[PDB]
């Protein structure tokens, strides 16, 4: 294997000598020279982990040295600072300071120009982080909501320009909110020019995708395959037209890319210095267990898979330092956990929390959630959770089988009821939610419905409000970044329409991404309403947790209640919080409480609370006491 002093000389022979001097000497160089120097080996260790003595190797990893090259010399010097300043503070991402959002850019404001209209509005929530959902061209019609990407340089002309984009990260920039966007690295759509000219036989792009002749491998395959959309076609594979078989583990329009040609991981790590400097300080990494193919395997969350994207990481290590990865693997917790390295992804998606947020909220039981807490929310150092209450996706009930078996819960039985409970079909219910992909064959199925409409906030539900108020302050306290979805604030109920939409009607997860609703936003100073008494409380704990160093980094220790409605637990040493998820009055004994101090100050509704006699807590209320 080739060292970094090596590779640096041959990147150096594109210049005559005289220009040579010149670059050795500057300061980008300088920079880019010691980066290699520290990031270089474990690049090569991880591509070498992969590719072993592929041929193409070598010649591969030349070219994208050259690129990183090329990529951080025209890297603007404000971008630089920012690469030095997270360089020396990893744990950025750890900080109480930050809070999260996310929206479309087209539903909550038409388009780019608009969404940075709306800036002001996200300093007044007090963003630090926005996630703005896949902007670039897609197929007309049905596009997985722009996941399915045509092209990763233009932006949807909907949307605007790609001058636009730049005007709007730099507007988020000036506001102190970061740039998130979608790293969609697994696939692209069926329309992109890789895809074309692969499936044309053009010999550039041999090998770019999984093409078969025929249905003997993919019937192989899709022995041990999960279906993610069955709805839409069975197993791993869609046909092609000439009669081939292609990889495509989401819709049929979009095909796997061929992370087992090298020049496919050069091809990416192309887009993410193109995408790095337009200046986004967080690539939401999309489908990452993915990545990896294996016969007699899931192909998910594959040794390999994480030793590309730790590849990936090493790139940005060296080109672009300010940029972070968040991980999306919704996937059993074991293996959730383990794209989150510094040296991976340092921060990544916690579906786990998130889905037992909904699961309490079903069965009034903390039991599940304590145990999460308990015993896999706390990380490696350098590294935090996103965590969040609802997204742009269905809710998949992804807690461990062998977790709940510990508890005497069958996750079959257990999943059968959460799913007909959220969709209104279970006596008494409260959710108002719609399914999503129920697999006939496996008996899975996932929900769908806003934060507002599985709350019980459609047919006014005296308690909704106070259940969203219950489960954001939970994501906004635990540790770790918190993620809003953007409309949640002012309790926005689900898009009716999506269901006769022929663009839409296959996907029920349109009926959770409903559009800037005009009349509830101007409603969000009003006390009375529900839009501004779930605005106020929300916006009330994002100042609690931005001011109070006492939410500060991701670990927790959990705190034994002695109440199986009523969780528990600690940050800091220093702040207790306890949470109602029964919607009757529930009781912390004195006797549980012996150990604390006798009175605490309450941050939530800015009492005194007297720890040396029972604590009798209303239905869904929330305290965050102050015990050092």
């Given at each position: 294997?080739?060292?970094?002093?090596?590779?640096?000389?041959?990147?150096?022979?594109?210049?005559?000598?005289?220009?040579?001097?010149?670059?050795?000497?500057?300061?980008?160089?300088?920079?880019?020279?010691?980066?290699?120097?520290?990031?270089?080996?474990?690049?090569?260790?991880?591509?070498?982990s992969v590719y072993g003595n592929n041929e193409?190797?070598?010649?591969?990893?030349?070219?994208?040295?050259?690129?990183?090259?090329?990529?951080?010399?025209?890297?603007?010097?404000?971008?630089?600072?920012?690469?030095?300043?997270?360089?020396?503070?990893?744990?950025?991402?750890?900080?109480?300071?930050?809070?999260?959002?996310?929206?479309?850019?087209?539903?909550?404001?038409?388009?780019?120009?608009?969404?940075?209209?709306?800036?002001?509005?996200?300093?007044?929530?007090?963003?630090?982080?926005?996630?703005?959902?896949?902007?670039?061209?897609?197929?007309?019609?049905?596009?997985?909501?722009?996941?399915?990407?045509?092209?990763?340089?233009?932006?949807?002309?909907?949307?605007?320009?790609?001058?636009?984009?730049?005007?709007?990260?730099?507007?988020?920039?000036?506001?102190?909110?970061?740039?998130?966007?979608?790293?969609?690295?697994?696939?692209?759509?069926?329309?992109?020019?890789?895809?074309?000219?692969?499936?044309?036989?053009?010999?550039?792009?041999?090998?770019?995708?999984?093409?078969?002749?025929?249905?003997?491998?993919?019937?192989?395959?899709?022995?041990?395959?999960?279906?993610?959309?069955?709805?839409?076609?069975?197993?791993?594979?869609?046909?092609?037209?000439?009669?081939?078989?292609?990889?495509?583990?989401?819709?049929?329009?979009?095909?796997?890319?061929?992370?087992?040609?090298?020049?496919?991981?050069?091809?990416?790590?192309?887009?993410?210095?193109?995408?790095?400097?337009?200046?986004?300080?967080?690539?939401?990494?999309?489908?990452?267990?993915?990545?990896?193919?294996?016969?007699?395997?899931?192909?998910?969350?594959?040794?390999?898979?994480?030793?590309?994207?730790?590849?990936?990481?090493?790139?940005?290590?060296?080109?672009?330092?300010?940029?972070?990865?968040?991980?999306?693997?919704?996937?059993?917790?074991?293996?959730?956990?383990?794209?989150?390295?510094?040296?991976?992804?340092?921060?990544?998606?916690?579906?786990?929390?998130?889905?037992?947020?909904?699961?309490?909220?079903?069965?009034?039981?903390?039991?599940?959630?304590?145990?999460?807490?308990?015993?896999?929310?706390?990380?490696?150092?350098?590294?935090?959770?996103?965590?969040?209450?609802?997204?742009?996706?269905?809710?998949?009930?992804?807690?461990?089988?062998?977790?709940?078996?510990?508890?005497?819960?069958?996750?079959?039985?257990?999943?059968?009821?959460?799913?007909?409970?959220?969709?209104?079909?279970?006596?008494?219910?409260?959710?108002?939610?719609?399914?999503?992909?129920?697999?006939?064959?496996?008996?899975?199925?996932?929900?769908?419905?806003?934060?507002?409409?599985?709350?019980?906030?459609?047919?006014?539900?005296?308690?909704?409000?106070?259940?969203?108020?219950?489960?954001?302050?939970?994501?906004?306290?635990?540790?770790?970044?918190?993620?809003?979805?953007?409309?949640?604030?002012?309790?926005?109920?689900?898009?009716?329409?999506?269901?006769?939409?022929?663009?839409?009607?296959?996907?029920?997860?349109?009926?959770?991404?409903?559009?800037?609703?005009?009349?509830?936003?101007?409603?969000?100073?009003?006390?009375?309403?529900?839009?501004?008494?779930?605005?106020?409380?929300?916006?009330?704990?994002?100042?609690?947790?931005?001011?109070?160093?006492?939410?500060?980094?991701?670990?927790?220790?959990?705190?034994?209640?002695?109440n199986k409605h009523i969780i528990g637990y600690?940050?800091?040493?220093?702040?207790?919080?306890?949470?109602?998820?029964?919607?009757?009055?529930?009781?912390?004994?004195?006797?549980?409480?012996?150990?604390?101090?006798?009175?605490?100050?309450?941050?939530?509704?800015?009492?005194?609370?007297?720890?040396?006699?029972?604590?009798?807590?209303?239905?869904?209320?929330?305290?965050?006491?102050e015990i050092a």
């Amino acid at each position: 294997s080739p060292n970094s002093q090596y590779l640096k000389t041959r990147i150096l022979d594109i210049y005559t000598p005289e220009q040579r001097a010149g670059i050795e000497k500057s300061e980008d160089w300088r920079q880019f020279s010691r980066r290699m120097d520290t990031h270089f080996p474990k690049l090569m260790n991880e591509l070498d982990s992969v590719y072993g003595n592929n041929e193409a190797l070598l010649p591969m990893l030349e070219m994208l040295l050259a690129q990183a090259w090329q990529s951080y010399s025209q890297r603007n010097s404000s971008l630089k600072d920012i690469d030095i300043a997270r360089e020396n503070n990893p744990d950025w991402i750890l900080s109480n300071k930050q809070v999260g959002g996310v929206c479309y850019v087209d539903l909550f404001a038409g388009d780019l120009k608009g969404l940075k209209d709306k800036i002001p509005y996200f300093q007044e929530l007090g963003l630090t982080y926005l996630h703005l959902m896949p902007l670039f061209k897609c197929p007309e019609g049905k596009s997985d909501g722009g996941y399915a990407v045509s092209s990763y340089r233009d932006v949807n002309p909907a949307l605007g320009t790609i001058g636009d984009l730049r005007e709007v990260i730099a507007a988020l920039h000036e506001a102190g909110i970061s740039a998130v966007v979608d790293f969609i690295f697994n696939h692209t759509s069926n329309e992109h020019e890789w895809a074309q000219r692969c499936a044309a036989g053009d010999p550039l792009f041999d090998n770019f995708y999984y093409i078969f002749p025929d249905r003997r491998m993919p019937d192989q395959y899709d022995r041990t395959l999960r279906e993610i959309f069955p709805d839409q076609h069975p197993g791993g594979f869609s046909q092609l037209e000439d009669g081939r078989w292609v990889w495509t583990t989401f819709n049929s329009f979009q095909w796997d890319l061929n992370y087992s040609n090298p020049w496919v991981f050069r091809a990416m790590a192309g887009e993410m210095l193109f995408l790095a400097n337009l200046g986004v300080d967080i690539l939401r990494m999309d489908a990452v267990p993915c990545i990896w193919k294996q016969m007699g395997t899931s192909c998910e969350n594959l040794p390999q898979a994480h030793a590309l994207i730790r590849a990936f990481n090493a790139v940005m290590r060296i080109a672009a330092p300010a940029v972070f990865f968040k991980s999306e693997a919704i996937v059993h917790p074991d293996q959730v956990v383990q794209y989150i390295g510094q040296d991976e992804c340092q921060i990544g998606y916690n579906p786990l929390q998130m889905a037992l947020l909904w699961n309490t909220l079903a069965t009034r039981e903390v039991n599940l959630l304590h145990q999460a807490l308990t015993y896999r929310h706390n990380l490696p150092e350098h590294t935090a959770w996103v965590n969040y209450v609802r997204s742009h996706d269905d809710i998949g009930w992804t807690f461990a089988d062998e977790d709940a078996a510990y508890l005497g819960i069958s996750g079959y039985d257990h999943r059968q009821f959460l799913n007909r409970f959220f969709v209104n079909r279970f006596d008494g219910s409260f959710a108002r939610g719609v399914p999503f992909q129920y697999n006939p064959s496996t008996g899975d199925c996932r929900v769908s419905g806003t934060a507002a409409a599985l709350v019980g906030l459609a047919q006014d539900d005296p308690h909704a409000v106070d259940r969203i108020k219950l489960l954001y302050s939970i994501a906004l306290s635990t540790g770790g970044l918190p993620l809003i979805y953007l409309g949640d604030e002012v309790g926005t109920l689900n898009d009716d329409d999506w269901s006769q939409d022929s663009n839409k009607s296959d996907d029920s997860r349109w009926a959770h991404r409903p559009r800037y609703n005009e009349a509830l936003y101007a409603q969000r100073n009003d006390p009375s309403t529900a839009a501004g008494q779930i605005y106020q409380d929300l916006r009330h704990m994002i100042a609690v947790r931005q001011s109070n160093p006492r939410f500060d980094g991701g670990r927790l220790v959990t705190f034994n209640t002695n109440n199986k409605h009523i969780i528990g637990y600690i940050r800091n040493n220093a702040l207790l919080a306890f949470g109602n998820f029964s919607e009757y009055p529930q009781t912390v004994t004195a006797h549980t409480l012996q150990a604390m101090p006798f009175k605490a100050h309450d941050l939530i509704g800015g009492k005194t609370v007297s720890l040396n006699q029972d604590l009798t807590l209303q239905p869904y209320q929330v305290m965050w006491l102050e015990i050092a």
